Amino acid sequence: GMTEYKLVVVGAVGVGKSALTIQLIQNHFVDEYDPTIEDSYRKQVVIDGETCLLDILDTAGQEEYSAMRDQYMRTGEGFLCVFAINNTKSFEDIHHYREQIKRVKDSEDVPMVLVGNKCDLPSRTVDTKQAQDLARSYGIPFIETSAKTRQGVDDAFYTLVREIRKHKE
Ligand SMILES: Nc1nc2c(ncn2[C@@H]2O[C@H](COP(=O)(O)OP(=O)(O)O)[C@@H](O)[C@H]2O)c(=O)[nH]1
Ligand SMILES: [Mg+2]
Numbered sequence: 673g674m675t676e677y678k679l680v681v682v683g684a685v686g687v688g689k690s691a692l693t694i695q696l697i698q699n700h701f702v703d704e705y706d707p708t709i710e711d712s713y714r715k716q717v718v719i720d721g722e723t724c725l726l727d728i729l730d731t732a733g734q735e736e737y738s739a740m741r742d743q744y745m746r747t748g749e750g751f752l753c754v755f756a757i758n759n760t761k762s763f764e765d766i767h768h769y770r771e772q773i774k775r776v777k778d779s780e781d782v783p784m785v786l787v788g789n790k791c792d793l794p795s796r797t798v799d800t801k802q803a804q805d806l807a808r809s810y811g812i813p814f815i816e817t818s819a820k821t822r823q824g825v826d827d828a829f830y831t832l833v834r835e836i837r838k839h840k841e
Contacts (some may be wrong), residue, residue, distance in 0.1 A: 674716075676725040677836055678747055679829065682769050683754035684762040685733060688789040691819035692754065693730040696829050701820050708732055719833050726833070745776040750783035750836040752828060755798065756790040757816065763788075763798045763806075770810060783835040784812045787828050792818040 681689045690705040697713045710732035716725050729748065735741045753769050755762040766786065773782055786807040788798065800816065807814035813831050817824035 674723045674725060676727055677833060678727045678729070678749045679752065679832055679836075680729045680731060680744060680748035680750070681752045681754060682731050682773075683752075683787075684756075684759070684765045687754045687756040687759065687762045688817075688819045689732075689754055690730050692752075692787070692789060692817065692825060692828070693728055695819050695822060695825050696728070701822075710735075717830070717833075719830050724833065726829070728829075742776050745773050748773075750785075750832045750839075752787055752832055753784055754787045754789050755803075756793075757788045757796045757798045757803075758790055758793050760797045763803070766806065781839060783832065783839045784810065785828055785832045785835060786810070786812055786814040787824075788814065788816045789819060791816045791823060792820050 681693055683689050685707050691702055693713060694702045694705065697715055710730060712727060712729045714725060714727055716723060729744055751773055753766055755766055774780065786803060788803050803814050812835065815824045815828045815831060817828055819825060
């Protein structure tokens with residue numbers, strides 16, 4: 673039979689984790705989705721000829737107990753590490769997410785895709801080079817997205833599944 677993959681969407685508050693996830697799941701852009709809600713969604717997709725089931729956790733940051741964060745990192749098979757291209761702090765936070773996920777999984781090889789979201793907005797502060805360089809330093813893909821226009825959205829999630837498949841192989 674087919675396989676279910678656990679994908680985890682991480683990043684600073686307001687970078688567009690929820691907007692990206694809802695676009696993938698429901699095919700519309702949600703302007704106002706409570707920043708404090710953490711939920712998961714299932715979606716069956718075909719990627720490279722193989723059907724699979726995505727179980728996507730849209731994270732919202734601190735948990736009641738940090739042990740709960742550690743648990744979703746341990747069970748998570750691939751991570752979408754999202755920053756917003758107009759928020760340098762959210763980009764610098766990626767260093768922390770990369771470290772923390774590796775630390776919790778006690779692994780040097782964790783499937784991830786770096787996502788620079790809000791690419792439809794003006795006055796970018798994080799340039800493509802910075803982000804491309806960081807992703808290269810991690811050995812992972814970098815994709816620029818807009819949850820509003822859908823630029824790169826499917827690409828980001830499907831690329832993450834490909835990265836999970838490569839890790840498991
Ligand atoms: N213009 C634009 N706004 C976005 C995009 N992604 C998210 N937003 C907005 O940015 C804010 C934060 O989005 P949200 O999905 O709630 O971020 P989260 O806290 O990471 O889940 C919201 O007001 C969204 O409308 C995007 O790609 N483009
Ligand atoms: Mg959210």
